[PDB]
Coordinates of C-alpha atoms in Angstrom, one line a residue:
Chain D
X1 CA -14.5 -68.2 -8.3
X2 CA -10.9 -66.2 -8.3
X3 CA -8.2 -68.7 -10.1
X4 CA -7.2 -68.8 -13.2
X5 CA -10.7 -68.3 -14.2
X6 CA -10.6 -64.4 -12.6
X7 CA -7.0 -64.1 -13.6
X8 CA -6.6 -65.4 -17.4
X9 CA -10.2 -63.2 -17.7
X10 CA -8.0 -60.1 -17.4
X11 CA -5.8 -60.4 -20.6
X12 CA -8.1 -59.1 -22.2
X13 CA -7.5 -55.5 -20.2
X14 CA -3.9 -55.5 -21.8
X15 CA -3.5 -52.0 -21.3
X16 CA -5.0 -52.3 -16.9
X17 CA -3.5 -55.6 -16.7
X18 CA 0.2 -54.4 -17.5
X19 CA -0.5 -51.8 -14.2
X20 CA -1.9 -54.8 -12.4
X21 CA 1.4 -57.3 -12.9
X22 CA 3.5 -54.7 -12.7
X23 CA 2.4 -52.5 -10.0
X24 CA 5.0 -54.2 -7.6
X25 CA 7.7 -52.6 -9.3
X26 CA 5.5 -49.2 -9.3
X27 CA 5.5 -49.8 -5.6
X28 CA 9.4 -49.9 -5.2
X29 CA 9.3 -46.2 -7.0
X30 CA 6.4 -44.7 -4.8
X31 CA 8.7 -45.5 -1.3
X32 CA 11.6 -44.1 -3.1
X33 CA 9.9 -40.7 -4.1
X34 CA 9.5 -40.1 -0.7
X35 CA 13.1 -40.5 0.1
X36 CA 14.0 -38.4 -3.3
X37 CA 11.5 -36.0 -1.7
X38 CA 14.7 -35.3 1.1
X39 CA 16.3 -34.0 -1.7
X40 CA 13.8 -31.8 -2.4
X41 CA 14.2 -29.7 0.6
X42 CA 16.8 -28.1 -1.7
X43 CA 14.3 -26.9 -3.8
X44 CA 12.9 -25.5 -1.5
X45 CA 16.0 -23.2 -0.7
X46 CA 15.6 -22.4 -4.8
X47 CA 11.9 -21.5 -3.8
X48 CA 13.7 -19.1 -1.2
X49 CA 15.6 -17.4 -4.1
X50 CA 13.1 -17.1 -6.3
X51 CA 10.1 -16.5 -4.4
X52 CA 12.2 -14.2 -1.3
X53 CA 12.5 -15.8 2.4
X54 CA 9.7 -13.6 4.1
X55 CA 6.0 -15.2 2.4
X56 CA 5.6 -15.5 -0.8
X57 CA 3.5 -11.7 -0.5
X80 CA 13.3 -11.8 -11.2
X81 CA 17.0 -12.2 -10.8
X82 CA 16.8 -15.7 -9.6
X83 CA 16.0 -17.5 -12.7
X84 CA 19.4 -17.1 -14.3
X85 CA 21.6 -18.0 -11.2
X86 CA 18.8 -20.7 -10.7
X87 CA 19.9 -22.5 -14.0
X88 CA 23.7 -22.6 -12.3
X89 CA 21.5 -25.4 -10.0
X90 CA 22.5 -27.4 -13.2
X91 CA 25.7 -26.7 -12.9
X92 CA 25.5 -27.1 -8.7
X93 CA 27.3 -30.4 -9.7
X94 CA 30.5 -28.9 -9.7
X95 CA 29.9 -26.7 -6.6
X96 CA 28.0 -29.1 -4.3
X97 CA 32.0 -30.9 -3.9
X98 CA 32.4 -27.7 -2.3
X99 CA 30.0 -26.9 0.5
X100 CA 30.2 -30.6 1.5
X101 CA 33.8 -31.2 0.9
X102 CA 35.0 -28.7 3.8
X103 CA 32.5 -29.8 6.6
X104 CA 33.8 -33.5 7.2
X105 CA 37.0 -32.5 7.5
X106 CA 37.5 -28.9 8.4
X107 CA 40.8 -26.7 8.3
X108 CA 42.8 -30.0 9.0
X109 CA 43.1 -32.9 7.9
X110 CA 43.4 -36.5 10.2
X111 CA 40.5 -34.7 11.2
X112 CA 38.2 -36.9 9.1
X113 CA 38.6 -39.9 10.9
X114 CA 38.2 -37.6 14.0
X115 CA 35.3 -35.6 13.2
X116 CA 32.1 -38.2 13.1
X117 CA 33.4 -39.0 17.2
X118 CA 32.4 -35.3 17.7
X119 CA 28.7 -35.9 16.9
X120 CA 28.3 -37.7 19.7
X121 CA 29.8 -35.2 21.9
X122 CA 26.7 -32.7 21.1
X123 CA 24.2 -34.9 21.8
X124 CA 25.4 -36.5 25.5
X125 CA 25.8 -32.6 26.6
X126 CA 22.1 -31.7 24.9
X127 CA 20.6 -34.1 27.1
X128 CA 21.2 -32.2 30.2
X129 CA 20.1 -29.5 28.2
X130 CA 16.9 -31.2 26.8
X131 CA 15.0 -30.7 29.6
X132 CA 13.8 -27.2 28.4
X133 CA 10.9 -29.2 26.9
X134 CA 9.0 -29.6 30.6
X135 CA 10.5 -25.7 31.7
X136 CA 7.9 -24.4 29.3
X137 CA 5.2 -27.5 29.0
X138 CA 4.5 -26.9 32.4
X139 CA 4.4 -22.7 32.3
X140 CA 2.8 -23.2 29.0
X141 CA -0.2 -25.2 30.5
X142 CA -0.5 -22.7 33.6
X143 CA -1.0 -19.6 31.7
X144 CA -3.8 -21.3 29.3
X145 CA -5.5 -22.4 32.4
X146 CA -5.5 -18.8 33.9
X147 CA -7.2 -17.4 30.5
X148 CA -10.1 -20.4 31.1
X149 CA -10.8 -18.7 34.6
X150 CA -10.3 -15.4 33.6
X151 CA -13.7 -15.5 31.8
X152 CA -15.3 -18.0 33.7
X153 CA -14.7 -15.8 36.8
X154 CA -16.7 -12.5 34.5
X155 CA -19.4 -14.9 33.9
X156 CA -19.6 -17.0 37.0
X157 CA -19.3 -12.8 39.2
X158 CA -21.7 -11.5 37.1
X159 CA -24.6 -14.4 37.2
X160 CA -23.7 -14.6 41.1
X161 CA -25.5 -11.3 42.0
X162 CA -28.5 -12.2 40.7
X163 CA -28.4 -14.4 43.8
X164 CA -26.8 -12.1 46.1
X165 CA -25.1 -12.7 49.5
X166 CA -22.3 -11.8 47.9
X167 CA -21.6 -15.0 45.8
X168 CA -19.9 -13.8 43.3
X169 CA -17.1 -13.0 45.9
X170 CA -17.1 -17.1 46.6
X171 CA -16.6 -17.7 42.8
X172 CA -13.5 -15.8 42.7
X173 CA -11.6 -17.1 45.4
X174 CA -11.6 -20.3 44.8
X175 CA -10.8 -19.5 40.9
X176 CA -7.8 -17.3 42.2
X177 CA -7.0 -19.6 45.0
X178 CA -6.2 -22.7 42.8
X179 CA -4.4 -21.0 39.5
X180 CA -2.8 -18.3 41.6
X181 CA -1.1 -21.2 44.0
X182 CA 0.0 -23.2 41.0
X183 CA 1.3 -20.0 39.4
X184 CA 4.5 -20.2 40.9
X185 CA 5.8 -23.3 41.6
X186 CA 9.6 -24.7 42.4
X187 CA 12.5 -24.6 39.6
X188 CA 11.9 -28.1 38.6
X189 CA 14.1 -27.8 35.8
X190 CA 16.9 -27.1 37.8
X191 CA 16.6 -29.5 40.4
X192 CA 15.6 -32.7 38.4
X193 CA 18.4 -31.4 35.6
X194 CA 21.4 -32.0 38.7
X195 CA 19.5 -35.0 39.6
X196 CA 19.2 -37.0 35.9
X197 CA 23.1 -35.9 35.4
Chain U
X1 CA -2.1 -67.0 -16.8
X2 CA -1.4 -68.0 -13.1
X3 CA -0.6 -70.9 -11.3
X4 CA -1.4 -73.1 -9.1
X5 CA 2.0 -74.9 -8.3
X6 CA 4.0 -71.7 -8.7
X7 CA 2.8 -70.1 -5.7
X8 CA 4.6 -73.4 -4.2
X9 CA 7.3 -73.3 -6.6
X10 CA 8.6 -69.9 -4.6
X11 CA 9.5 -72.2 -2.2
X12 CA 12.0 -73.8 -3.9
X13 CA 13.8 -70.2 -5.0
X14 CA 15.4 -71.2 -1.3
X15 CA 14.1 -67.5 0.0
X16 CA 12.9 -65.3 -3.5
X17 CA 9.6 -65.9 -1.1
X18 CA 11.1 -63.4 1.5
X19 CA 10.4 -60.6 -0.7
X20 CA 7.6 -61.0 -1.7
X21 CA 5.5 -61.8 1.7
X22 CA 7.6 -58.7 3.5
X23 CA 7.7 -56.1 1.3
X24 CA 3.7 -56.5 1.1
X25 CA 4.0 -55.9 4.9
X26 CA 6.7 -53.4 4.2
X27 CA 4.4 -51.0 2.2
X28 CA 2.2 -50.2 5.5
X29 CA 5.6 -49.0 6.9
X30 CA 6.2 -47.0 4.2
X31 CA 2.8 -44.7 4.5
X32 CA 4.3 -44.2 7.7
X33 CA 7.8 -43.1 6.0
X34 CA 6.0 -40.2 4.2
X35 CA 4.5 -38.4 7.3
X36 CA 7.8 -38.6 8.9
X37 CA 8.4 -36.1 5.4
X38 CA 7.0 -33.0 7.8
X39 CA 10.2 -32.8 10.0
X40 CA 12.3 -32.6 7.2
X41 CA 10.8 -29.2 6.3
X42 CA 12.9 -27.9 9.3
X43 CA 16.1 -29.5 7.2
X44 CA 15.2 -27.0 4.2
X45 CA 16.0 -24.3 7.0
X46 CA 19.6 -25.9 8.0
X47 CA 20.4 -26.2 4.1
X48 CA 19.8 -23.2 3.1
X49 CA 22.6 -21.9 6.0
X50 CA 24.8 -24.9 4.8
X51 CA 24.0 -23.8 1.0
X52 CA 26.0 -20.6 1.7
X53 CA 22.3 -18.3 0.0
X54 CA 22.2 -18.9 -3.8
X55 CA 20.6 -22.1 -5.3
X56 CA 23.7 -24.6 -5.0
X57 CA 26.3 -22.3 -5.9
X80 CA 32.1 -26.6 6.3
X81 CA 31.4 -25.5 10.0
X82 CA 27.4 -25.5 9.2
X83 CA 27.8 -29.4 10.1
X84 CA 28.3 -28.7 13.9
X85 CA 25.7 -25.7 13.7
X86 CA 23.2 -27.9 11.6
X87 CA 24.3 -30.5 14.8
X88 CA 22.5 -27.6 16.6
X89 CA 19.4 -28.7 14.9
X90 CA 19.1 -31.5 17.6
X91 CA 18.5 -28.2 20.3
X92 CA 15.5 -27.7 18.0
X93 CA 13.5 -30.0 21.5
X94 CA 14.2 -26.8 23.9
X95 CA 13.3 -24.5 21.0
X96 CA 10.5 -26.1 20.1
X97 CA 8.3 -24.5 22.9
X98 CA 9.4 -21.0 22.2
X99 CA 8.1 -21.0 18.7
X100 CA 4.8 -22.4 19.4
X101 CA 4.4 -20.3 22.4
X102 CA 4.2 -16.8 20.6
X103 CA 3.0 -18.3 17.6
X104 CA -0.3 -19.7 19.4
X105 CA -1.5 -16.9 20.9
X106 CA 1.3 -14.3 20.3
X107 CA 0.8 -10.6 22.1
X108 CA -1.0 -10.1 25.3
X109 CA -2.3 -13.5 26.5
X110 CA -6.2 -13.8 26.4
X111 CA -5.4 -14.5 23.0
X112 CA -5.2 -18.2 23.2
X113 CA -8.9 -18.8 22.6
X114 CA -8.8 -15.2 20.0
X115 CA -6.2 -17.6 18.1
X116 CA -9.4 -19.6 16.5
X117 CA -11.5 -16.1 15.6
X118 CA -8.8 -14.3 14.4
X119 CA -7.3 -17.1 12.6
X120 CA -10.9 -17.4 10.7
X121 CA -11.5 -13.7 10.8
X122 CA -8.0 -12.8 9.0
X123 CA -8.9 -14.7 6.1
X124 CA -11.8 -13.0 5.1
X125 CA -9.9 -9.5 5.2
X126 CA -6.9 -11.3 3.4
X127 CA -9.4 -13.1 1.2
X128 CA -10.7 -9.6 -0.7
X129 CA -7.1 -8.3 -1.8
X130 CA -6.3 -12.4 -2.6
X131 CA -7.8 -12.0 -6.2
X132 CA -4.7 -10.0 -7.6
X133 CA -4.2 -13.2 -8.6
X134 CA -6.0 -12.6 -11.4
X135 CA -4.6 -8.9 -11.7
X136 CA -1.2 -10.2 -12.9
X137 CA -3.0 -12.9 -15.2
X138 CA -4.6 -10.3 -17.0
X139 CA -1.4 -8.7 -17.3
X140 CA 0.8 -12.0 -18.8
X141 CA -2.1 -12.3 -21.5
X142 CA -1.6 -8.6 -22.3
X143 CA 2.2 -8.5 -22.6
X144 CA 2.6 -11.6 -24.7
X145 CA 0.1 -10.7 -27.1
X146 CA 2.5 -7.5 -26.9
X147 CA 5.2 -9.5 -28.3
X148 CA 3.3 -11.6 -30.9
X149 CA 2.2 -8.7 -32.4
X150 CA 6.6 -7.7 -32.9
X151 CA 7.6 -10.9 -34.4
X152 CA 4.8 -11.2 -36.7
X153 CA 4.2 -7.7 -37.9
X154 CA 7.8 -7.9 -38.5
X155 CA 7.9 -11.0 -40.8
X156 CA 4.8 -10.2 -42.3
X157 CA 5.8 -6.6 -42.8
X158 CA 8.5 -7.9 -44.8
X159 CA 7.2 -10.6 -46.7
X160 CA 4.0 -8.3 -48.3
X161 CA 5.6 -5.5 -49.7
X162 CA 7.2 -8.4 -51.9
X163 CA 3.9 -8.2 -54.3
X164 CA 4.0 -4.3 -54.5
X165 CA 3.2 -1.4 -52.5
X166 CA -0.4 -0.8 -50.6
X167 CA -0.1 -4.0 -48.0
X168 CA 2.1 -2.2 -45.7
X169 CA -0.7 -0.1 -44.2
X170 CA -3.2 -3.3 -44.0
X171 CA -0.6 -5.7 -42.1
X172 CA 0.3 -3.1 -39.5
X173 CA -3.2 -1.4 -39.6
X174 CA -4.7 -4.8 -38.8
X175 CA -2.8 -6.3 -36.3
X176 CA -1.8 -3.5 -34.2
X177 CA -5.4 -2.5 -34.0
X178 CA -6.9 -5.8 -32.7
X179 CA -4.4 -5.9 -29.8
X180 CA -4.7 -1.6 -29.3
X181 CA -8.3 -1.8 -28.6
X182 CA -8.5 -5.3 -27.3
X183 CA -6.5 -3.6 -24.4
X184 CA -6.5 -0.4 -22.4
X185 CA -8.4 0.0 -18.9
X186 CA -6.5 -0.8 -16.0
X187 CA -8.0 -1.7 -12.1
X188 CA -9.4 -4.7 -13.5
X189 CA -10.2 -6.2 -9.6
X190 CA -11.0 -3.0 -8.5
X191 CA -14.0 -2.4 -11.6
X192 CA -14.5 -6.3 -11.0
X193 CA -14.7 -6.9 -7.4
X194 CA -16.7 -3.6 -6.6
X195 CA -19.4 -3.8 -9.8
X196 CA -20.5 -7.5 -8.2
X197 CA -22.2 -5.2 -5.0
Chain M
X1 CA -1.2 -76.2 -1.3
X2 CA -3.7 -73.3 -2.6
X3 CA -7.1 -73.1 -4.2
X4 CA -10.1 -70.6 -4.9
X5 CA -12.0 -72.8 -2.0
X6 CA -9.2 -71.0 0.3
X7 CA -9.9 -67.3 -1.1
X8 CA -13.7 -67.8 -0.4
X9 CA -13.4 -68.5 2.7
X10 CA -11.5 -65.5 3.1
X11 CA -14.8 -63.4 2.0
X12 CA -16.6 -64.6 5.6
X13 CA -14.0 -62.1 7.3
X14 CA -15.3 -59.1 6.0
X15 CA -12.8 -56.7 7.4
X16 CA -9.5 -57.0 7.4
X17 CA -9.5 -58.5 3.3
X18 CA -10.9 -54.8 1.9
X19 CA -6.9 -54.1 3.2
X20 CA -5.7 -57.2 1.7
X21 CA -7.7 -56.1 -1.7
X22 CA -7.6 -52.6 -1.8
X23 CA -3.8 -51.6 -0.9
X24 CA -3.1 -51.9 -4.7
X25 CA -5.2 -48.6 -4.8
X26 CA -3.6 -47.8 -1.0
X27 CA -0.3 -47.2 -2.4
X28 CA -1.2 -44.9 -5.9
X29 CA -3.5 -42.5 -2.2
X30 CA 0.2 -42.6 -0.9
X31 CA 1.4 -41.1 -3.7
X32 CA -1.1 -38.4 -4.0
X33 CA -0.6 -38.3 -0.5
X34 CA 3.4 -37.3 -0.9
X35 CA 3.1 -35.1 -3.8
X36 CA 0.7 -33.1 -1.4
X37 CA 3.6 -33.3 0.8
X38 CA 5.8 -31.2 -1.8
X39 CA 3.8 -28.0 -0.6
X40 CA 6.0 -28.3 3.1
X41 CA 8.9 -27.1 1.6
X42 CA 7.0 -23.9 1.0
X43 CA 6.6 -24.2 5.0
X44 CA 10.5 -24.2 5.4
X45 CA 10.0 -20.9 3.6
X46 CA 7.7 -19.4 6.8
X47 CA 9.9 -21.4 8.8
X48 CA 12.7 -19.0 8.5
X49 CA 10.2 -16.4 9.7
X50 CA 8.4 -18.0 11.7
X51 CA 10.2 -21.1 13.3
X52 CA 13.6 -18.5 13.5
X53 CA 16.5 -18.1 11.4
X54 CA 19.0 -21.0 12.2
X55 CA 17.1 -24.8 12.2
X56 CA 14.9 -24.9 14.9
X57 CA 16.9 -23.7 17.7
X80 CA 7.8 -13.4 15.5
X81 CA 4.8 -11.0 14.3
X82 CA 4.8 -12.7 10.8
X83 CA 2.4 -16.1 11.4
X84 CA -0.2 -13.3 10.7
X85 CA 2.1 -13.1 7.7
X86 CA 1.9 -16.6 7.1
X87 CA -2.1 -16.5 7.3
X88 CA -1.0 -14.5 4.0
X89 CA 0.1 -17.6 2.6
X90 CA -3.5 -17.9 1.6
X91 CA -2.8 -14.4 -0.8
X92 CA 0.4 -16.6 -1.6
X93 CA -1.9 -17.2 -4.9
X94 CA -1.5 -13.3 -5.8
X95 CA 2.3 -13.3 -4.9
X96 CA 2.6 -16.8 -6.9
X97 CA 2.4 -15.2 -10.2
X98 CA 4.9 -12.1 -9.5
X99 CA 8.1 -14.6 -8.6
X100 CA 7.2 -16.8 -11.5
X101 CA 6.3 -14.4 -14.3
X102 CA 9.4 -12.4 -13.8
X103 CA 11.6 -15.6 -14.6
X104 CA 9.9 -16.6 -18.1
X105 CA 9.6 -13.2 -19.2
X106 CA 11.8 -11.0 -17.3
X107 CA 10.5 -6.8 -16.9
X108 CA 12.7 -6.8 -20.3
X109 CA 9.9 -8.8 -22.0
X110 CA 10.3 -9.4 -26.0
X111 CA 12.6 -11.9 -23.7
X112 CA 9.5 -14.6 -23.2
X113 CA 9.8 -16.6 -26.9
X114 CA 14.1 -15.5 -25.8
X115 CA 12.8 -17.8 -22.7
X116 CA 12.5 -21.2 -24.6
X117 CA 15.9 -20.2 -26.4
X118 CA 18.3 -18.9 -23.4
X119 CA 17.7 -22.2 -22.5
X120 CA 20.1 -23.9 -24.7
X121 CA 22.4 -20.9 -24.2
X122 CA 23.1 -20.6 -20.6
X123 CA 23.1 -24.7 -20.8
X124 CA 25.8 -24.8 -23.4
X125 CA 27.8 -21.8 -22.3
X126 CA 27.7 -23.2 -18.4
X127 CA 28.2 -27.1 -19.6
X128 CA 31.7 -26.4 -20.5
X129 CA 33.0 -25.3 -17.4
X130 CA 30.7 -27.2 -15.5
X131 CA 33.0 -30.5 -15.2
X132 CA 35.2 -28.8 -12.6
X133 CA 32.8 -31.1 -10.6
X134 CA 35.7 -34.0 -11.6
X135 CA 38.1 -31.3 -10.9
X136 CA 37.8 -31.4 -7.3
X137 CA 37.4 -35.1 -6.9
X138 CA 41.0 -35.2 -7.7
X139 CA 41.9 -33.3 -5.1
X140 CA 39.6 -34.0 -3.0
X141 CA 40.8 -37.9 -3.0
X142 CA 43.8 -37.0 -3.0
X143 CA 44.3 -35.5 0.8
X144 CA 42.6 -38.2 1.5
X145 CA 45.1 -41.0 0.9
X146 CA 47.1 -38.5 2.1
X147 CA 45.5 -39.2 5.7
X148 CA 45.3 -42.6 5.8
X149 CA 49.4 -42.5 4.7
X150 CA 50.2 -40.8 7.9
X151 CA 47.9 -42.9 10.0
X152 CA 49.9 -46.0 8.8
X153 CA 53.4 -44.9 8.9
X154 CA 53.0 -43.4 12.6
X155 CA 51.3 -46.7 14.2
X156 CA 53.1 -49.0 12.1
X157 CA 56.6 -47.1 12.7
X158 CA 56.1 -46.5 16.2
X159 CA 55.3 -50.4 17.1
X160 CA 58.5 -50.7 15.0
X161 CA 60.8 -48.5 17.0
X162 CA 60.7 -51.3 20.1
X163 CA 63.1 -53.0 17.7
X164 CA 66.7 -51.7 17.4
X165 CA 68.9 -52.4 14.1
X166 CA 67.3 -49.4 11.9
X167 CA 63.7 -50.4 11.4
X168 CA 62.5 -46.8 12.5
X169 CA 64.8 -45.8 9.1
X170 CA 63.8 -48.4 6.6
X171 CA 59.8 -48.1 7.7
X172 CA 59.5 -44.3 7.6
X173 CA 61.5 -43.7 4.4
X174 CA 59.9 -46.7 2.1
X175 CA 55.9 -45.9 3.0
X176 CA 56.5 -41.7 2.7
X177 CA 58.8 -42.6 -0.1
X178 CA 56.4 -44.5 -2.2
X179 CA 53.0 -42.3 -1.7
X180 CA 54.6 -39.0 -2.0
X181 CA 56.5 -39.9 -5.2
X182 CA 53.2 -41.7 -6.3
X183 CA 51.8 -37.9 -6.8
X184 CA 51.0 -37.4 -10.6
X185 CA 49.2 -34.2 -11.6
X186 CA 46.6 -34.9 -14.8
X187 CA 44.6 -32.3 -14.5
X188 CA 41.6 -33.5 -16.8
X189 CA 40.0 -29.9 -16.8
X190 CA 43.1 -28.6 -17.5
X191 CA 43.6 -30.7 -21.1
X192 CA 39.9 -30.5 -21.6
X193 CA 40.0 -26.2 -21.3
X194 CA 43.2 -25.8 -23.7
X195 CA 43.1 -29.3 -25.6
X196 CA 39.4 -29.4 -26.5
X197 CA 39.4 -26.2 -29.0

């Protein structure tokens, strides 16, 4: 069982076995694609110029060659962000990074603003027709039960409707 | 073949070992690496601003820094996107999603328009290079092929191709 | 140390092992799995539309319900860059390929052009960054070491400055 026995057995697959031994270096290649995937995402700007930003529902192939020759260029884009219009600034410049992200997390808390807004008006459209439904089937009864259905519908969404800036409060109390 | 005493050979390579029983555990973690791949689309976005608009031919650093905003954001695109217009729409989002796609779905076969057209052009521009050589090459033995070679060839692709609709004689005949 | 009596006994956990002996084929899924992942950076595309114009921080997601029709589009921003409306251009289209290569490859190695300059501010910062601290800690001292310290470094770097211009000789040299 396995061993040598299960191993040697497999020379004689030369061609599979090469994949099998080998594979480990295979693997090395398939985590790096997905890392030579980020740069990808520049195709994808390429798709933009050949294929138009609105959906994909000419001119672009012989600027898109130039791509080749984006070596020379791509010193450019890059080469002016680090530093900006002044130098002793690129020593300078990486501190500022962290100066956007300590404000944006006073900021952040848009992300409960609308969760919480978000939520309540979904809810509303669940009672909404419930509430046609739940009045309609009602009369059948009578006694005016359908009345019964929609106040306590409207009584819990309408309350919650409105509630306190949260945002605001909790954003002077974190910072 | 394998080995028995090489497995504990390893280790002896003082820590060759460390590769081997870590990257294994390594590769899980990668899987993981390729759906973080998603986000990254939104990084296509920021370099086609920091890419100037042409294929690959400076302040875009701190407005790309912006990206990290993309949290408060976040809501505000999903939020029109989801149900988008009026607001009973929410649960409308699954019909007309599915609905959409069988209107869309009848004009989709164009696809095959254009294909009918790159077989028709390039047959087109066979027909120029070789009626030229061939042109040239039999009036070498006398006078009479001339009419054949052009007759012959410009005749197969004339008839081959004339009527145009092609979906719209297509997709309406299979009622 | 090892054995095949070891494996065996592995076989009595019929679970976890399937992992253990069918990751080999796990990693070759991942990389279907990520070239799948290629068709996001069409999403970047909608994004701009869809997910706004800058990063992250309208109407058209019925547009991108369109993306289905994307099929139809597909072949109007491709077949335009083989063939061109000129057409007569497509066999041209395996040709202009060497052309626009060896036209563009000559200039193309400005890339090395702005390395050199590019390096050069560079030094230029770290020069200043020295003399200033080192001079300054200097200064405490009387005698003339603000002089001597000041004079030497700027001395030294600025006369350092050499302009070989590589694409210079290789524009007027290599003809």
């Amino acid at each position: 069982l396995l061993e040598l026995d299960k191993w040697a057995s497999l020379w004689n697959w030369f061609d599979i076995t090469n994949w099998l031994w080998y594979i480990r270096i295979f693997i090395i290649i398939v985590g790096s694609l997905i890392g030579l995937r980020i740069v990808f995402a520049v195709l994808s700007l390429v798709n933009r110029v050949r294929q138009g930003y609105s959906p994909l529902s000419e001119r672009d192939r012989d600027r898109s060659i130039r791509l080749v020759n984006g070596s020379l260029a791509l010193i450019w884009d890059d080469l002016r962000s680090l530093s900006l219009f002044s130098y002793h600034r690129l020593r300078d410049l990486l501190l500022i990074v962290t100066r956007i992200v300590e404000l944006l997390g006073r900021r952040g808390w848009e992300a409960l603003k609308y969760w919480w807004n978000l939520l309540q008006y979904w809810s509303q459209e669940l009672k909404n027709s419930a509430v046609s439904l739940l009045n309609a089937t009602a009369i059948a009864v009578g006694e005016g039960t359908d009345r019964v259905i929609e106040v306590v519908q409207g009584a819990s969404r309408a309350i919650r409707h409105i509630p306190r800036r949260i945002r605001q409060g909790l954003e002077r109390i974190l910072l």
